[PDB]
Amino acid sequence: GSISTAVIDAINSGATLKDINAIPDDMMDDIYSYAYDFYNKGRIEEAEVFFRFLCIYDFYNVDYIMGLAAIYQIKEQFQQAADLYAVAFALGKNDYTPVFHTGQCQLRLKAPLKAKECFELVIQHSNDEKLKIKAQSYLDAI
Amino acid sequence: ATLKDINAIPDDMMDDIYSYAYDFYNKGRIEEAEVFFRFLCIYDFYNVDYIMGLAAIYQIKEQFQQAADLYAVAFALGKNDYTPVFHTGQCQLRLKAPLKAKECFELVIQHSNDEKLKIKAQSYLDAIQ
Numbered sequence: 001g002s003i004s005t006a007v008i009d010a011i012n013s014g015a016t017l018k019d020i021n022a023i024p025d026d027m028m029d030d031i032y033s034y035a036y037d038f039y040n041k042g043r044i045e046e047a048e049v050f051f052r053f054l055c056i057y058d059f060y061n062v063d064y065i066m067g068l069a070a071i072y073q074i075k076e077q078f079q080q081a082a083d084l085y086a087v088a089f090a091l092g093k094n095d096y097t098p099v100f101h102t103g104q105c106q107l108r109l110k111a112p113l114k115a116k117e118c119f120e121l122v123i124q125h126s127n128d129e130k131l132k133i134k135a136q137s138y139l140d141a142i
Numbered sequence: 143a144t145l146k147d148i149n150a151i152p153d154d155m156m157d158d159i160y161s162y163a164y165d166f167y168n169k170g171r172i173e174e175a176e177v178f179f180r181f182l183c184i185y186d187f188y189n190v191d192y193i194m195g196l197a198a199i200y201q202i203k204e205q206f207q208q209a210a211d212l213y214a215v216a217f218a219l220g221k222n223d224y225t226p227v228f229h230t231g232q233c234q235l236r237l238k239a240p241l242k243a244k245e246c247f248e249l250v251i252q253h254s255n256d257e258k259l260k261i262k263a264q265s266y267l268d269a270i271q
């Protein structure tokens with residue numbers, strides 16, 4: 001998956017496609033918009049390939065990671081989604097949406113204590129009042 | 143309508159992506175090559191070399207029927223090229239279908255003008271019981 005590719009790239013330390021600027025920003029933006037065109041039409045499998053492609057080229061990109069994590073969550077691949085949401089948070093530390101969605105995933109993974117920690121973080125640190133209500137609704141059910 | 147039909151990505155960038163897909167393939171980075179060849183086949187299903195790349199990945203992963211299916215399409219997408227038929231013969235042998243495999247290698251021998259490919263096909267035929 002995306003995470004194992006990132007680790008292999010790091011182990012081998014050899015030149016990556018991004019290291020040589022193999023794909024311009026403008027083309028990456030286009031491919032990202034095509035990925036959502038597929039996603040928005042319900043073509044989830046093609047969207048997944050396109051987000052995997054983006055995450056091979058530029059793994060450390062919150063927008064690409066969040067798109068792939070959403071697909072895994074929809075596909076009920078909850079651990080893969082949770083792992084990617086955590087990468088996104090590490091790279092975009094001021095947005096608690098990935099923490100909220102990780103909480104949902106942990107609930108489906110039968111890890112209510114991990115889910116509780118996620119929803120509590122949202123309520124303590126997010127300034128998104130609507131996201132906080134949603135997190136509290138989950139907490140109320142735990 | 144394909145993404146290629148509307149020139150969604152410039153030709154030179156697609157060439158680079160194909161070369162990167164083959165780089166992953168040659169380095170044994172099969173998961174990444176598979177993503178890249180799937181990307182290429184979404185962009186232009188009608189490109190025989192893109193299809194052959196994905197079929198090769200499936201064959202390496204021992205998804206022999208899935209490979210054979212794509213090879214039949216590739217044979218339609220190529221220019222009198224019996225290489226996909228040769229690889230279908232290999233897949234059929236792995237699927238325990240030796241008479242189907244024999245027919246594949248015989249077709250290569252009878253129609254192909256690629257002498258090196260025919261040598262390979264004959265070596266398989268010689269071993270079939």
Ligand SMILES: Cc1cccc(C(=O)NN)c1
Binds near residue numbers: 086087089113115
């Ligand atoms: C994305 C994120 C950030 C912080 C904590 C968690 C978690 O799962 N705690 N149990 C997840």
Ligand SMILES: [Cl-]
Binds near residue numbers: 095096097126128131
């Ligand atoms: Cl937030």
Ligand SMILES: [Cl-]
Binds near residue numbers: 110113115
């Ligand atoms: Cl837990």
Ligand SMILES: [Cl-]
Binds near residue numbers: 204207208209
């Ligand atoms: Cl198969």
Ligand SMILES: [Cl-]
Binds near residue numbers: 240242
């Ligand atoms: Cl048979």
Ligand SMILES: [Mg+2]
Binds near residue numbers: 123124125126127
């Ligand atoms: Mg507050």
